[PDB]
Structure formats: structure tokens, C-alpha cells
Amino acid sequence: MTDYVFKAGRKDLAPLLLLHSTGGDEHQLVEIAEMIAPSHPILSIRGRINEQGVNRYFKLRGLGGFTKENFDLESLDEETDWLTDEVSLLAEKHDLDVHKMIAIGYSNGANVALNMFLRGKINFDKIIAFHGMQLEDFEQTVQLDDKHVFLSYAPNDMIVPQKNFGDLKGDLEDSGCQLEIYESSLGHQLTQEEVLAAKKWLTETK
Template identity: 35%
Template sequence: MIHYYRKGTAPRTFVLFHGTGGTEEDLVSIGTMLDPEAHILSLRGEVNENGMNRFFKRVAEGVFDEEDLKMRAERILKEIEELLARYELKDTALHSAGYSNGANMIAGMLYLHGDVFQKSILFHPMVPLKSGPALSLNSAEVFIGAGINDPIVPYENTTQLMQELSRQGAFVTMKTYEMGHRLTLEEVEDAKAWYSAP
């Protein structure tokens, strides 16, 4: 898997997942804002949709290919494990951040594989799987940034995601914004404040 790695100075690793059409470099500056001392491991989605990189296939706008999502979630987890070993990061705390399609990929991994990340920051996500989360998320903390007037992700869908994660034991904080599907500085700063809180 194509990826970007930057060595950090703290025992924390941030795994970053871009949105549709992005690359492994898109969220590096945001990851640095969230935690300047963490190791950065930023991934590029392997699905090509009309020239745009994605982490899993979809049938239509807002309609996911759930079997493809399941297959790729497992593949990405194995890839992360290999990269952690390669860069000698296995003993670091593992966190994640993603935007849109990348946030949906993280949510899918939480649904399918439990609390694989200690802290996850999901910018404009939606429910990844109709079946809901399968495992306990008692050790997971999740920040969700939602657009109250997001034309791509219905607000009710993101609220459902928050409820389903919470029901499985995750500690979820959700904040809403009025800039549609755009990721704003305010949203990143709120995520940083959440992430940095003791």
C-alpha cells in the first residue's frame, strides 16, 4: 500500500485516511496539528473510482459495497500491522483520523474489529455497515465532526453512527458545524482540544 511516514518523538502513532480523490499527503498537515510529536502514518486508498482514490468501493453516492468494505478493512489492518513492525512502532499508542471516505473506513474497522484504535477522529462520517458494530468498543474514544447541512452525509445518519458506537461502549463526542461537507479549521481545532484533553 502506498503510504507516507514521518518519524515522531512521542510513543504515539497517528494513522491517517484521506477522503475520496485524496492522497496519502492530504491529511499530513492536519495530523501534525492534532499531535505534532506523534509518528505519522498516512495511507492511500487502493480503490480507483473514475480516477479518484478511495478506501473501498461504493454502489452509488452514499451506498457502500459492504462486502468490499469488509475485505479491505481486514487488508488495511494487516497492512498497518506490517508498517508498525517495519518502522518499529508496535509499542506506540495507535490513533486514527480520517475525512469522509477515510472516516467511513475507520468507522468500518471499528464496527468489524473492535477498538483497534485508542482514539479516532472522524470528520464527516456516516454509518459504514447496516448490521451495526459487532464487537465491544469499551476502550475506544471517538470524536465525530458532522455538518448540520452536509449535502453528502445526512445529519441523521451521523447521529445514528454516534449512537451505534456509544451502544457498543465507545466514549463518543460529536460536534456539529454549518459548513456542509467542508473540513474547517474550527473543526480541526475542536478535534485537537478533544484529543489533547487529559
């Protein structure tokens, strides 16, 4: 039984899909999204992974000393099939248009949104990814030439290697995306300043 929040907002405005960080839940990003995109309908879906009571979108290997080697790509693939189908089903139920959807994710959720976009599993209109990273290297057969995407990064983020963030930006730009990059100073932590930066960016790109 899917754990999710829907908050109607103004029906004619683009819907937001919220995706939480590790250990977050469907309520984590709600007030943040309300600051970024006031009045927009909100759909927020909890990850299905709960190993040791930590909510996540896909499994780790536990090789916690590693970055990409710790990501279970079979799980990533299975859960992203599930999530794309779930988004379509709930958009159906709540009369939302997936092609207008703005994904707003933080860490784990941001990674999953970015991966779905790059794999062509969901045609989001825009993505706002706070402290995201590349999960896997693959052949992208997506063309995203018209799309706008906001990414934050901190150079003291122990979790996201510089090279890894370079590969994420490169995969998006190779697909044709127009990127805005915001640099924060609190490592992996979501900052008030990066959220205001995304709010401002959305007013410019909306």
C-alpha cells in the same frame, strides 16, 4: 506496491494513522495531523481504489443518488481486511504500537476507520473522524467501553443524512464509547475550527 507516508516524529508518542477523503491521497492530512497531534509519528496509507483516477478506500455501486445503497459492502469488507493487515505490517516495519494508534480520517477515510473499529478489525486507542457516517448496519460484537472518539457533523452536509449520523453515534455508544461531537457549518467541507476542536479534545483525552 503500497502508497504510504511515514514520518517518524517522537518515537515514544502514540502513532497517528491518517486516512484521506475521496479523491485525496497519502499526503492530504499530513499538515492537519501535525496541528492536531504535534510531534506524534505519522502513518498515512492511500486507498487502493482508483476508478476514474479518484482515490478511495472501497468501491461505490454507482447509485450516486443513494447513501448506503451505493456502498459496495463486499469491497468494503475486502479492503478493510487488506488495510488492517497493511497497518499491522507497516507498524511492524516502523516499530509502531497499533494498540496506541489514533486514527484521524476525513470523509471516506473516516468511514473506513470507524467501520474497522466497530467490526473489531483494528484495536485503535482513539478515533478522530471528520464528517464520518455509518456505512452498514450489522451486529457489533465489540465492546469499546473505555474508548474515546471525536466526531464532527454539519447539519448542511448533503452527504451525511441526520438519521445516518444518529445511527453512527448510536452504534458507538451502544459499544460503550465516550463521544465528543463537534458541529461545523460548512457542509461536508473540513473546517479549520473542527481541526482546532480535535486538537483541544486530544489534549483533554490523550
